[PDB]
Design a protein around this ligand. Sequence first.
Ligand SMILES: [Co+2]
Length: 118
Amino acid sequence: SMPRFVVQEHHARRLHWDLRLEMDNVLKSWALPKGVPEKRGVKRLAIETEDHDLSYIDFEGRIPEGMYGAGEVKIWDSGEYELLERTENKIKFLAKGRKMNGEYVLIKTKVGWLLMKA
Ligand SMILES: [Co+2]
């Protein structure tokens, strides 16, 4: 297998959380400066970032200074997910994490992305 996701908490120069979905045979990724929305109605900024390799999904440890992405990476949540809808401008999924669960939607507009919870 079932596709998985991870939310990594990344203590870099700007603290943020990275949401990564196993999708298109890579980790499709978004940085969340204020984290995953944990209740209905809350609309969080999501910043599309570069694809990562599948093997990175379980990573924890320190990205060294001088490298792009420096800082400590921890797993904040993880689990399987079920894809419900997908186009170039919308991704709707059921998350099966311990913190991130139920349905969520990523949307793309002319200003970037947003992440919301059902
Ligand atoms: Co990051």
